[PDB]
Design a binder for these strands. Structure first.
Length: 894
DNA sequence: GAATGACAGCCGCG
DNA sequence: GCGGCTGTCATTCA
């Protein structure tokens, strides 16, 4: 196999690398890497090297990396650009591995681990690591085993060994229900004391040092803990054995040289794009697997004594959940994939600046071009996306259209790049350009409304670099589109397979099956066809990953581009992009309004009701009324109608218009393409209103079709309203949705009935479902002797009413800083001395105050403030009454 | 970023 | 008091 790297570090004048060699065994080597950098030279000096601007550069090969850095400092001290890749690990990686790297994930040691630390006095700070580590479950992907380290004796308890038979049993039998698919993979190791345990762990770690270290929150707790604990008990010298190169750096995040840490909690917050209200392994675990972490009774701090059997099983299942999630989401793989693509240390996968730099670097390197020295830049804010102010109201029929990959496309269309800047032009006001009344900026260069002018005669580095990715995206998606076709020509080729013992043919499922190997296949045994589709899958699976990676770079490029720490950052350019986009969305709004006014005979009617960055929402009321609502059989009939109107009437007008704008700004290439996204309206023959907007980023639509796919039942698309906020009490968060559903699909009368009913039934709801949820920060900065200080928030003042109601109690759950807290208003004259009273979330109020809380809680204020207030918000905008007998005059200002 | 809403707290008011 | 506002927090949505 072709060698590939595992980790790379720069220690002094040496590069330390862990890699898989020719035979496939893990190795480490120290290399006195000699980097090259470049300085500008005169035209005379012949040379193959040039900077992105064409100017000639001379290669300077150094004796070692320190001289390289030293030189970069003198160049700065003089005032002359020091060109070249300053991050030598990157250069070293680009040098040692210049060829697409094909990696064997079965040879990379990927470790997931979690520890347990019985602490009776509050969360155990990793920096103190003041308590014993009573358990460690460390799963190793290479051995595919769960190595468990159980501490038997601790200042907090001596316990029996953990039982595996018991762990295997069911809940009802007293077992811990550890899945049978890992039950034989566990390796238990109990110890007499923490020292014997840590030293054995430290040893195990040396015999199986991780390459990829993951787990839930390992970078913020597990690692810093184990590190500090070992450091405090044995020497710091010993705690360093945790690094294969014996080196560590304390940022409290311990960085271990020679290891890549992809905290799974961060890999989730990155590549899942599913903003969740909580990031606890339990919450996220239920979400992805419909099963959470093991359940136990009492407080964790007392679980090791009370039930050490469940304690150890809990630690094993915790590590196992993460593995399951990743078995689904595949993020570690995605990370490996992307890291080797750009030739960077896997952890850099988290950095777009770092990722793109390395990609553009290796590309320009292949052309003997040298990259610019990254200059320092003031962080200066510039304009961003355009968002229209919607007229608050109900909207019966709406169709939205989305510009595809807007920002990367604008980069390509205008050809925006640092080295393709060609000048500027007098900038007229942005509206003038939106209406084509401003003077054509230039008929020589490709322009942008902010005043920049780019060359059209050359391919900018950024544009070229982003286009390859777009192409590769298309390419791979192409491959795995065939892995599909070829999927059926093998899936049904097994429903009626002859009985001829043979072997699976040799075809490239990336490319559609030919006839020579299309029917020659639908006549093989059964032992082959079932393998025929094993290759069809693996292939397809491969496609998805590359295609997903490509999509992630494309969408992150602008991120890097707008960042002042990016090598190609340029305020002028960052602004060319966003302003251009700003013009695009409004110009096309102008066209859509014009086209629809003509094909409707109306005059100056505002069809586009809303736009946000790359989206426009068009009202279709008129288009529907042209055909007369009555002439439609069912709901599905008009949904079909609008779909066609869009595809054969609107989209062509759109392209035609965008096509005009391209010529107007003299752009290198027309890449502004729109897609019809949603189609919403109320159920035909119903009193439903279909949709409404209360303001920017705040709306709800009853959608029937999204990008072509027709739903069985309409799906509510709600953006920004309280139903989407986690601070809203469960019961309310679901009644508000029911209110919106009744409004869009059923109408005012339906809504009013639910409302009345909900009020009538509010007090019968469980006090936790109707409690607000909030996170407490600066909980101390606002209290003075247990009381609310100056500018003290509502949830925080609340916490202090809880504190001054349980002060002097250790069996009562404490409100820590950061974590979420339920909040509730109390009637005046309550024993707690204040308006609100919070307490930790996910828990029930301590029974020592509970009965009085359930008593004094101000249902009225609660209802009004969390339910009625926000609904009134929705109903006002939708011109609806959630209560019969309401006055029309209320909607007027004085 | 471009934006929104819950709340605190300081006006200006016979 | 309370509309008008300004600043602090808490949470979403491109």
């Amino acid at each position: 196999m072709k060698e590939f790297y595992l980790t790379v570090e720069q220690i002094g004048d040496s590069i330390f690398e862990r890699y898989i060699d020719s035979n496939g065994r893990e190795r480490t080597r120290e290399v006195e890497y000699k980097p090259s950098l470049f300085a500008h030279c005169p035209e005379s000096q012949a040379t193959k090297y040039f900077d992105i601007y064409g100017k000639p550069c001379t290669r300077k090969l150094f004796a070692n990396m320190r001289d390289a850095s030293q030189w970069i400092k003198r160049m700065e001290d003089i005032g002359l650009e020091a060109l070249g890749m300053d991050d030598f690990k990157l250069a070293y990686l680009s040098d040692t591995y210049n060829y697409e790297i094909k990696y064997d994930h079965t040879k990379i040691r990927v470790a997931n681990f979690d520890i347990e630390v019985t602490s009776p006095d509050g969360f155990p700070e990793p920096s103190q690591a003041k308590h014993p580590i009573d358990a460690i479950t460390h799963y190793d992907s290479i051995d595919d085993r769960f190595y468990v380290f159980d501490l038997l004796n601790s200042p907090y308890g001596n316990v029996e060994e953990w039982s595996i038979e018991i762990a295997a049993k069911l809940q009802e039998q007293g077992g811990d229900e550890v899945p049978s698919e890992i039950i034989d993979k566990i390796i238990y190791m109990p110890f007499d004391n923490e020292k014997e345990l840590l030293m054995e762990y430290l040893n195990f770690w040396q015999q199986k040092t991780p390459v990829i270290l993951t787990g839930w929150n390992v970078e913020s707790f597990a690692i810093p803990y184990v590190y500090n604990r070992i450091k405090n008990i044995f020497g710091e010298s010993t705690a360093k054995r945790l690094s294969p190169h014996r080196k560590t750096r304390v940022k409290e995040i311990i960085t271990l040289f020679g290891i890549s840490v992809l905290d799974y909690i961060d890999l989730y917050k990155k590549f899942s794009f599913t903003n969740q209200p909580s990031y606890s392994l339990d919450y996220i675990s239920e979400f992805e697997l419909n099963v959470g972490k093991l359940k136990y009774d009492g407080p964790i701090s007392k679980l090791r004594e009370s039930n050490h059997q469940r304690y150890i099983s809990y630690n094993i299942i915790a590590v196992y959940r993460v593995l399951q999630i990743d078995a689904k989401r595949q993020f570690i793989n995605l990370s490996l994939d992307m890291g080797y693509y750009a030739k960077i240390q896997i952890q850099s996968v988290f950095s777009p600046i770092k990722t793109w730099d390395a990609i553009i670097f290796n590309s320009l390197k292949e052309q003997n071009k040298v990259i610019p020295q990254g200059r320092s830049h003031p962080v200066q804010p510039y304009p961003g996306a355009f968002v229209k102010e919607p007229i608050p109201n109900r909207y019966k029929y709406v169709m939205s259209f989305d510009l595809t990959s807007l920002y990367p496309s604008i980069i390509r269309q205008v050809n925006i790049s640092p080295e393709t800047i060609a000048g500027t032009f007098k900038v007229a006001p942005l509206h003038d350009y939106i209406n084509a009344v401003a003077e054509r900026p230039s008929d020589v260069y490709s322009c942008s409304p902010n005043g920049m002018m780019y060359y059209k005669d050359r391919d900018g580095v950024v544009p070229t670099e982003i286009t390859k990715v777009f192409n590769q995206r298309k390419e791979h998606k192409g491959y795995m589109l065939a892995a599909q076709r070829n999927g059926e020509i093998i899936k049904e080729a097994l429903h009626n397979p002859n009985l001829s013992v043979d072997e699976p043919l040799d075809v490239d499922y990336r490319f559609d099956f030919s006839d020579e190997i299309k029917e020659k296949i639908k006549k093989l045994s059964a032992k082959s066809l079932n393998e025929m589709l094993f290759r069809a899958q693996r292939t397809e699976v491969a496609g998805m990953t590359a295609q997903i990676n490509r999509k992630l770079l494309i969408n992150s490029l602008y991120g890097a581009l707008g960042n002042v720490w990016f090598r190609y950052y340029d305020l002028r350019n960052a602004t060319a992009i966003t302003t251009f986009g700003q013009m695009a969305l409004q110009w096309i709004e102008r066209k859509v309004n014009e086209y629809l006014n003509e094909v409707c005979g109306t005059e100056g009617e505002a069809f586009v009701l809303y736009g946000d960055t790359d989206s426009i929402y068009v009202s279709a009321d008129k288009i529907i009324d042209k055909v007369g609502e009555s002439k439609f059989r069912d709901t599905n009939h008009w949904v079909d109608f609008l779909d066609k109107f869009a595809r054969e009437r609107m989209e062509p007008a759109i392209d035609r218009g965008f096509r005009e704008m391209c010529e107007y700004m003299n752009n290198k290439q027309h890449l502004m393409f729109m897609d019809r996204e949603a189609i919403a309206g109320p159920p035909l023959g119903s009193k439903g209103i279909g949709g409404f907007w209360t303001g920017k980023k705040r709306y709800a639509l009853n959608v029937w079709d999204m990008e072509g796919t027709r739903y069985a039942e309409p799906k509510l698309k709600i953006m920004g309203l309280e139903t989407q906020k986690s601070s809203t009490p469960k019961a309310v968060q679901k009644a508000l949705k029911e209110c919106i559903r009744r409004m869009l699909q059923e109408g005012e009368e339906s809504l009013q009935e639910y409302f009345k009913e909900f009020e009538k039934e509010f007090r019968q709801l469980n006090y936790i479902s109707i409690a607000s949820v909030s996170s407490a920060n600066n909980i101390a900065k606002y209290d003075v002797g247990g009381f609310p200080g100056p500018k003290c928030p509502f949830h925080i003042r609340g916490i202090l009413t809880y504190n001054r109601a349980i002060k002097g109690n250790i069996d009562a759950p404490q409100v820590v800083e950061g974590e979420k807290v339920y909040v509730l208003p109390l009637r005046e004259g309550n024993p707690f001395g204040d308006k609100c009273i919070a307490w930790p979330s996910g828990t029930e109020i301590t029974d020592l105050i509970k009965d009085d809380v359930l008593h004094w809680m101000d249902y009225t204020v609660l209802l009004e403030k969390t339910f009625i207030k926000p609904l009134e918000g929705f109903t006002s905008a939708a011109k609806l009454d959630y209560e019969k007998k309401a006055s029309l005059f209320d909607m007027f200002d004085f």
